[PDB]
Every structure is written in C-alpha cells, then in structure tokens.
Amino acid sequence: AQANEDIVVSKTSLWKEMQYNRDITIRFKFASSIVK
Amino acid sequence: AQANEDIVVSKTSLWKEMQYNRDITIRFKFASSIVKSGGLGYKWSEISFKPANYQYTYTRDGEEVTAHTTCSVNGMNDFNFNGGSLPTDFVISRYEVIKENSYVYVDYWDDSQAFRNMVYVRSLAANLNSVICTGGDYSFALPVGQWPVMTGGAVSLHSAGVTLSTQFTDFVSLNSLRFRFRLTVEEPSFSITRTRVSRLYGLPAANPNNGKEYYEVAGRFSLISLVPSNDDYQTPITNSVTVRQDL
Amino acid sequence: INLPITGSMDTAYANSTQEETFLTSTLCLYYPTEAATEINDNSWKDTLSQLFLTKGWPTGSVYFKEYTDIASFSVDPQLYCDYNVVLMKYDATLQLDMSELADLILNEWLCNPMDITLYYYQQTDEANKWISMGSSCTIKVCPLNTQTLGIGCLTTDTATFEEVATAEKLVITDVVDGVNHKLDVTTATCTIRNCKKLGPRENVAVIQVGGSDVLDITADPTTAPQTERMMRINWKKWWQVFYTVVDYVNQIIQAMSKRSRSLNSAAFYYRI
Amino acid sequence: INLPITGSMDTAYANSTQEETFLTSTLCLYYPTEAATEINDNSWKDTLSQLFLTKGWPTGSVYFKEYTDIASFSVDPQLYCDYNVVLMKYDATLQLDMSELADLILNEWLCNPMDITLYYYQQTDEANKWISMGSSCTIKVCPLNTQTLGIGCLTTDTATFEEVATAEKLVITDVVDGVNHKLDVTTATCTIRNCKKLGPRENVAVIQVGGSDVLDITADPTTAPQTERMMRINWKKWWQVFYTVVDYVNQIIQAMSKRSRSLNSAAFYYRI
Amino acid sequence: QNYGINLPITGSMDTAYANSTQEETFLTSTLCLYYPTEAATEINDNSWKDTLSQLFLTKGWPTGSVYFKEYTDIASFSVDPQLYCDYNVVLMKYDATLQLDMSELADLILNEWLCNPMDITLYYYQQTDEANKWISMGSSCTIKVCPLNTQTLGIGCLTTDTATFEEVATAEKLVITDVVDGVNHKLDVTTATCTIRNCKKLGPRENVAVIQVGGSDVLDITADPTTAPQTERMMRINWKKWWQVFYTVVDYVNQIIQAMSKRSR
Ligand SMILES: *[C@@H]1O[C@H](CO)[C@@H](O)[C@H](O)[C@H]1NC(C)=O
Ligand SMILES: *[C@@H]1O[C@H](CO)[C@@H](O)[C@H](O)[C@H]1NC(C)=O
Ligand SMILES: *[C@@H]1O[C@H](CO)[C@@H](O)[C@H](O)[C@H]1NC(C)=O
Ligand SMILES: [Ca+2]
Ligand SMILES: [Ca+2]
Ligand SMILES: [Ca+2]
Ligand SMILES: [Ca+2]
Ligand SMILES: [Ca+2]
Numbered sequence A: 001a002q003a004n005e006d007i008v009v010s011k012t013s014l015w016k017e018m019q020y021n022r023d024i025t026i027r028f029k030f031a032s033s034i035v036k
Numbered sequence B: 001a002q003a004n005e006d007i008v009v010s011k012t013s014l015w016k017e018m019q020y021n022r023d024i025t026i027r028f029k030f031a032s033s034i035v036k037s038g039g040l041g042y043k044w045s046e047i048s049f050k051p052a053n054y055q056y057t058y059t060r061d062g063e064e065v066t067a068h069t070t071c072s073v074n075g076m077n078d079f080n081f082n083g084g085s086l087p088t089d090f091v092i093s094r095y096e097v098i099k100e101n102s103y104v105y106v107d108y109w110d111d112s113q114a115f116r117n118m119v120y121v122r123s124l125a126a127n128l129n130s131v132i133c134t135g136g137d138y139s140f141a142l143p144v145g146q147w148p149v150m151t152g153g154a155v156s157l158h159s160a161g162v163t164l165s166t167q168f169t170d171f172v173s174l175n176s177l178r179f180r181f182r183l184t185v186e187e188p189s190f191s192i193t194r195t196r197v198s199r200l201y202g203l204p205a206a207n208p209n210n211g212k213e214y215y216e217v218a219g220r221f222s223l224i225s226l227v228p229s230n231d232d233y234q235t236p237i238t239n240s241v242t243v244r245q246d247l
Numbered sequence C, D: 001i002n003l004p005i006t007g008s009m010d011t012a013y014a015n016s017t018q019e020e021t022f023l024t025s026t027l028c029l030y031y032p033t034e035a036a037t038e039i040n041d042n043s044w045k046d047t048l049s050q051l052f053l054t055k056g057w058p059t060g061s062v063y064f065k066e067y068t069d070i071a072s073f074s075v076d077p078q079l080y081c082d083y084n085v086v087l088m089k090y091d092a093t094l095q096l097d098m099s100e101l102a103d104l105i106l107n108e109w110l111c112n113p114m115d116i117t118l119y120y121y122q123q124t125d126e127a128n129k130w131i132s133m134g135s136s137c138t139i140k141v142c143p144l145n146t147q148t149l150g151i152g153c154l155t156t157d158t159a160t161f162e163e164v165a166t167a168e169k170l171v172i173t174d175v176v177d178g179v180n181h182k183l184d185v186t187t188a189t190c191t192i193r194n195c196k197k198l199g200p201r202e203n204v205a206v207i208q209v210g211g212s213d214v215l216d217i218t219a220d221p222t223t224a225p226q227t228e229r230m231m232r233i234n235w236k237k238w239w240q241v242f243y244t245v246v247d248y249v250n251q252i253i254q255a256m257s258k259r260s261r262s263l264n265s266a267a268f269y270y271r272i
Numbered sequence E: 001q002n003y004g005i006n007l008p009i010t011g012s013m014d015t016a017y018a019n020s021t022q023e024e025t026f027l028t029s030t031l032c033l034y035y036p037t038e039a040a041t042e043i044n045d046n047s048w049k050d051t052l053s054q055l056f057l058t059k060g061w062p063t064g065s066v067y068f069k070e071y072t073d074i075a076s077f078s079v080d081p082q083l084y085c086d087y088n089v090v091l092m093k094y095d096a097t098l099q100l101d102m103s104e105l106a107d108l109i110l111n112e113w114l115c116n117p118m119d120i121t122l123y124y125y126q127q128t129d130e131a132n133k134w135i136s137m138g139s140s141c142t143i144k145v146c147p148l149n150t151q152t153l154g155i156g157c158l159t160t161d162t163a164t165f166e167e168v169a170t171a172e173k174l175v176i177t178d179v180v181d182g183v184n185h186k187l188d189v190t191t192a193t194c195t196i197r198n199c200k201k202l203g204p205r206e207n208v209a210v211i212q213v214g215g216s217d218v219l220d221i222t223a224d225p226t227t228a229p230q231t232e233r234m235m236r237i238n239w240k241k242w243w244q245v246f247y248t249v250v251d252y253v254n255q256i257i258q259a260m261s262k263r264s265r
C-alpha cells in the first residue's frame, strides 16, 4: 500500500466510487485587518 | 447536421452523456474603475479594469435566446505618469494597459439546453473569429487649467484556448464557458493630449468601449456534458448574497 | 415498368421512322448572338425553316432561341422541345464553364433544395453534387470533423473558408464524400441545389464550333469520355455552320433519342 | 524470375485489396506553387490528410511535395513513394517540355553515362534515346558518314553543328539510328545520358489540370496514345481539383499498379 | 520472364560444375573504387589512375571498365552516397572520433534500404519492427525526439517547448536513428539543411565492399547489440603507405569480387 494511492471501490456505466489516501503539507497563513 | 445539434453518445438509466454543437454570439463589454485622489483634483489614484457583466437577448434560427456574458482582463501592465510633486501638476499614480503579455477572459452563458445542468464537460473546443478592440476618449476633468484627453488605442483580440468558469453575481450564479483571447498590438496608439506622452501601443483602461454598447464576436462551441436522462431537472441559478458584511 | 420485355432475332426490320418522327416532333436550335451579328439578316430563320422543309421537318416544327453568352445561358437553362441542338463557341477562358453547361444539359439531374443556415450537408455517392445558378455565385466550404468544428478553417470566420468559386454564373461542385461541409454562398444572387446525376438526357446535342474536344462531363479524372451527342466543327463563318447542320440533321437526330423519364421544361427535376 | 506461372478459371475472386493497400502503402502528390499561392493557407496539407483519412489512407501515408516549375521538376525528378500523383498545368509554350516530363516519369529508363569528348555514340533501336538534364542545356550534333567525316558539318567547327536544344532544362533527343553523332553540350551545367526505354512505370499518374490532350509519350509520330494513368481536368480553382483527386483517388490507384522492377528514387536506373 | 512473382526453382546434385564466369564477368562488368583525398595527396601523381588501369588490364579488367571516384572525407561521402556501378569498393580510414560515422556509412551502403519520405510538421511516427529506422542526411543534422503516450501527450518532454526534447544527434552529416518500437515520436529537425527518411532494412547489398585501411574491426552494423557481425565484404588492412594498399587491392581484386555478388534488385 502506497502513501498516495488511488483505488476504485466501485464502477458503474458512467460514474465510479474512488478512494484517495494522500499526504499533504498545509502551508497556511493568517492576515490582519487594521483600521485607524 | 444542424448548426444547433444535440446528440446522445451514451445513456444509462438516470444519467446520459449529451453532445452539443451550437453557434453563439458573444456580446461583451469592458468596464473601468476611476478613483481620483483628494486635494484639488490634479492627482488620480487608479484607472483600472473591473469585471463587467452584460445580459442580452439575441435571435437564433427561429428562436429567441437569452444570454449572460462577463468580461475580465488578466496580466495587464501598470503604467503611471508623474510630472511634478506639487498640487497643481497633472499626475496619474497608476493606470492599466493591455499588451501581448495580457489576456482577456470572457465567460459566456445562455438559457439553452447546453447550460441547464452543466457541471461536467469534456471534448471541449470552439471556433472563434478575431475582432479589434479600440479605446475611446476620456477627458480628465481638472479643476482649472487645460483638459488633457486620453484618446486612442487599438488592439486585436485573437481566439485562444477554452475552459469552464463560474459567473458569480448578486442575482444569478452560472456554470459558464470561459473563452480566452490573446492580444496583438495594432497601429492606432493611445496618447494623453497636452502632455509629454504619445506613440505607445496598447489599450487604455478609461474608455475601452469607445462609446459602444458592446463588442460583438460570433463563435461555435462543441462539448459533451452529463445531464440527467429526465429532461425536467434544474440546477440552482439565482442567488441572494450577503458576503463582505465586515466590509 | 418492373415487368420484362421479350423478342426475337427472326423478325423483320420495320420501315424508317424518320420522315414521321420529324413531322410529329419539334426541333430547336440554340445559337449565340455573334451568329446573327455576323449575319445581319432578318429572315434567316424563315430561310432555314424553308431549307429544313426539304429534309422533311415541316414549317412550324423548327425553332431558334438566341442566347447572348454561354454563361447567360447556363443561368437556369430551359430546354422545352423534342430535339435540341446547341452551338457552343470555344474559349480556353471558358473551358470549365462550357463543360459544366454540358454536364448540366447532356445529363438528367434530380435536385433537392439546400438550406445552408439551418443545415450542413454532405455528398453520399459519386453521383451526388451541388449545382448552383445565378448572376454571381461565390461558394466557399469548410469541411467538418466528428464534433462539428473546422478542419483547416474556422466555422465562423468566412475568410478562413476554402474558395471553390469566384463570381461564377453556374458552378458544379463535388467535395469529399463522407464529411459534412459548412457552406457560404451569395444566396441573395444564387440558388444552390443538391442534385443527383441520373441517366443521360438523349434529347439534346452539343456542337463545339471551334477548338478540339475538351468537355469532361464526368467529374472523375479517369474517364474523360466523348459521348455520341458531343460533336465538333471547325469554322470560319456561321452560314456554313448552319448549312452543315441542315445538311447533316439526319445524323444528329439519329445520334439523339427522345426521352423516357418524364415531361419537363427545366434542366433538372425537383423533388423537394 | 524466368519460370512460368499456371492457374485456373474456377478459383474464386478474392476480397478487395483496397482498404489494406491504403494502410500498407504511401501516396505522394506533386503540386505547383501556383496552387499554394491561390490557396494562401498554411494548413491545407493537414486538411487533405484528415480528408484522405475518411477514404482510408492513414495519417502518415499522405505526402505533398511542392515543385515551383515543370522544368525545375524535370531537372532530375526524384519520385520515392509507392503511389505518385502529379498535377501538371497546361501551357502551349511548354507543350514539348511537359510531354518529355511525362515520357520520362511515366516510363522506366535504364541509363548509361556519355563521354562526348573521348567517344562518339549512336542509337541502335527505337527506344535508345539521349536524355539531358540540367539548368540550361544547349545541344548540337553532327552526324558522321562511314569513314568518320562530317555530313553537313565539320568535326572541328562547333557552329556547323545542328542545334536541337536551346537552354532547355530537360531534353529527350532521338536521332537517326545506325549513324554515329559527334555532340556538343554545355557539360558544365548539364549531364547527358544514353538511356533505353523499358516497360512503363505504373507507380505514377499524370493529371493535366488544364487544356486538351497534347502529351505524345511515344516519340514515333504514329501512335499518339493515351494511357490509363494520364488524366485531364478542366479547372478554374485548385481546391476543386484537390477535392476531386481525393474523392476519386480510388479510381486513380485502380488505374495505377505498384512497380515490379526494383526500389529506386530516381526516374531512371543507372548501370554505367 | 515473370516479374514481381516468386516461384520454386528445382535442381539436382548430379549436374556437373559449369565453367568459370571470372575473366568474362570482368569484361562485361565495371568496377569502381572510392578512395580518399589523402591517398592522392600522398601519391602526388597525375597518371596513377592510368597506371592502376593498365595494371588491372593484366588481371582482365579492361581500360574503360575501371573507375575511380574521389571523396574528401568520410562524412562528406556519407552525405547521399551514390554507388552506381556493377562492382563497388570503398577504402575507409580509421579514426576513433569517427567510429560511429563509419559504422553508419557501412550500415547504409552494405545494406539495401527501402526508404519512404517523412513530414515532421504534420505527422508523428513510430518504428514497427527491428528493421525500421530513420536515416537523415545533409550538411548539418540536429535531431530531437519526444516519445508520446496513449493520449498524445509527452513523456519527459513538452509537445510545444522544443528545448525539452531529447537530443540524439548534434551536427552530424549522416545519422541512423533507432528509437523504441511502439511509441509515437514527435521530431524536430533542421529540415533547411537535412532530409530524413523512414527506411526499412531489406536484405544486404552484395555489390559494395568496405576496406578498413587502419585499426581493428569496429563496425557494429546491426543496431541490436547482440550480433556484432563481420560479413565477407568487410575487409581490413594495415597501412603505412597507399601505393601498397592499391597494389594489394589490384593483386587480390579476384577474391574481392568473389566476395561480392551482383545485386538482385
Ligand atoms: C417499307 O418499304 C418498302 C419498300 O419501299 C415498301 O414496299 C413497304 O410498303 C414499306 N412498309 C410499309 C408498311 O408501307
Ligand atoms: C470476402 O468477401 C466476402 C464478402 O464481403 C466476406 O463475406 C468474406 O468474409 C471475405 N473473406 C476474406 C478472407 O476477406
Ligand atoms: C570448361 O573447361 C574445360 C576445361 O578447361 C574446357 O575443356 C571446356 O571447353 C570448357 N567449357 C566451354 C563451354 O568452353
Ligand atoms: Ca462555372
Ligand atoms: Ca482554410
Ligand atoms: Ca462527390
Ligand atoms: Ca524540353
Ligand atoms: Ca550544318
């Protein structure tokens, strides 16, 4: 089992149920609003 | 094949892949934002673009089709002209111009069957014709003295890639078709009269329409979307927005 | 008639139906203005009728119909007679035009109309073509792909279309059969019709008055045939032309044969 | 192979080899710069490829090769494909030139070089001709009697010679067979070769886009033939010509047949 | 006299050994040497061709049957070689900086290729079998290739940005390119100066004979790195002069032309 897999837990004529298990690095940031 | 075909390339019980191949008349329009700094009136703060909506109703081959278009610009260049530090010299802190490195986006939407429940699209492609966007004449209304006029500017819009987008507005939200346009600078240049600036290509962001009601360009688009088999389903269009309450 | 016919090789050859088909049939010539101009006579029609009277055609059976030019005749021709002869002047600057005229009158066409705005058409077989008539026809075509967009052309920008005709009175157009074409036509001045080429028209007879045989009826390049009713003459006057036609009118009408399809005064049948 | 072949008449007609020869063969058009000019499009090659694709010819099998002039093409024509089509304009002032071109590409030649200064050559049969290529050939020849003297010419005075070409890019020279000729050629710009005409090249198909049939492939003034891979169109545009060639390419390839002799890119074999 | 057809030929084993065709194939055939400019330079004579032909005369090759055709260098000869004679010999110098050049030359002349044309701008090509290659000639060829995937997109390269392409050739006069068989490749080539042709290798050309004048056997004709053959018409020599080389070629021309057999085509 990989770290960034991609599986198909079902499949119909057009749609499909896929499973995704993936690692991420959330590089977020705040921002302030000053009012004088 | 008709010019406004609608074909089915696959159909399961509830869903169906419907192909659409249709002609369109994109009538769009720029819109400019003019912010003038305080003091006497000799300094302008910004002359920039604002995404501009325009809804119209045109005639198809024996049908009346209502539409909704939204023009925007990306990657514009920010020029400026400052002739003095005193309150009586005409200065423009930042004004926008369009050149090759910029792009012109146009979101398009109709009341037709193609855009009724469109959330998924593949095999997207379009044949668009090229047009020429010419700027107008904006008279900087100074308090006293002379009246410089930013006049001129021509630039040719050529067809480019196509994508999807979402037109958000205070009334309707539309899952729409995004046509891109690239720019090739034309011969008519824009120049601020009674000033030391002239013979510079591009389009000015003060009066791009040139007193026109819109810019017209005809096209054709071809896609394949997912539509429920039952031709009675409806996706929410209208809105009631209360965003930016802090603002 | 679906039924068959039977016969035998022992029966006898009947008498000549000539000298009766003349009486109970009409003949019509199509001459250019140039002929009457070079002639400068006002009774040449009655003269030629009195001459035909010796060959057997009675007085009120021959007719003459002027046409100022090959193209002005090509603009919606109307052959309404029982035996038509056409005299056609040769000019290398008009070769394809006076071959299209041949392809139109010598053959028998079944034509449907065409609505370019609402529809995009295509040719099924090697006998379907698009024939367009009017005062100035400028025809451009953009072939299309599986998804109804352009191939080396833009479905809207008519400059990117491919020009197959430039201010032509009669155009016969064949395109790649099996693909859909979007058309641009001077519909104000020209009508275009999707026409199928049926069996030939044995009622008419073209006579090229000048140069060597060039008419290629068949749009395919391999055949280049020469039918029996496609004649040639070498000329320096027009009175000699008409005297030759009158002297050898029996051979011409033996090379021609009355029609079987229907009664029709146009150069093409209409079936909507 | 020298052995014989045997067969029957009960054996059955196998399926159509068309729709597989298209996949396993190549097609190559030779068009004039006039056509590219009148078209004024930079995607018509891809257009025609996508069109042919419906006729069965796959993408990477169709090729187009621009040739600016009939004479420039006549200068060592290099055909290396399995099915060659040539579109040839008509000009009275170039009649013999575009006839020699046909005579050269339609037929298969076996060529030895010629050393004018050191040796003196003759023709043996009615198929041993002297073909000269180059940018400007001006050829002169002196026939010689039994005792190696001149006849109406002198072995030294190049002005007494008999001129047969005047700055011609391709010439095919047939002289009396049985007598030795002393030649004078602009060897700096032209090469001349003693060639023998073999059986025909069935890989090429000439298409005279314009006027009446003029090509006399055979040098003798008695046959004046018209082979099967030698067509004639009447034209006013070029897109119509190309659409026609496409719609009727199957008849063209049925009129052509892949070669038997060997693999070669030139229009003639070399055997020293 | 049936052409284009292949039929079974019969034979036996009690038939007698017919007379020698040598001393008649010489009279009814022509020979052609391809010598480098270095040799004439070292010689410094204007009658050596006549001398060699008068010598050949003793071996049976008459005056107007032998020919000499000069070439300045291996690559200048690699540019569109026209070997049009009944017997062809090619003297070839050895230089480690030109091993691939004089292997490609051998691969090109010793073997009989069936060459179809190519149009890079429109079409994207692939090699079907182990005998389909792309031979490019000209004065300066610079070839770059991008493999493509099932959906007509790149593999370690961008269909638009030519720089991303993988360079297999850099200013070569003759290149024989073999790429992976089964994947459509998009190409960029200096078509202004070079012409490229999709060529299938048929059976060999028995009408030519390469003679390597210097170093050991290096020519890897077969693209597959498993055979590494050495045919009968791939000869080798050691040299300190060129007159000795030409005398040797003359004195042993009979074995050379016994190793060479006239073409089938
Ligand atoms: C046909 O011609 C012959 C010879 O003139 C004549 O005797 C005969 O009566 C003709 N037939 C009829 C039905 O009159
Ligand atoms: C030959 O043609 C017939 C008729 O189309 C077809 O039924 C048959 O399968 C074909 N056989 C081969 C071997 O192509
Ligand atoms: C073949 O060689 C033998 C021995 O030299 C000779 O006697 C015979 O005549 C030769 N054959 C022919 C056809 O000359
Ligand atoms: Ca016409
Ligand atoms: Ca076009
Ligand atoms: Ca057709
Ligand atoms: Ca000539
Ligand atoms: Ca003389």
Ligand SMILES: [Ca+2]
Residues within 6 Å of the ligand: D123, D125, D126, D127, D128, D129, D174, D175, D176, D177
């Ligand atoms: Ca002769």
Ligand SMILES: [Ca+2]
Residues within 6 Å of the ligand: E100, E101, E104, E172, E173, E174, E175
């Ligand atoms: Ca090399």
Ligand SMILES: [Ca+2]
Residues within 6 Å of the ligand: E156, E157, E164, E165, E166
């Ligand atoms: Ca890369």
Ligand SMILES: [Ca+2]
Residues within 6 Å of the ligand: E127, E129, E130, E131, E132, E178, E179, E180, E181
């Ligand atoms: Ca390979």
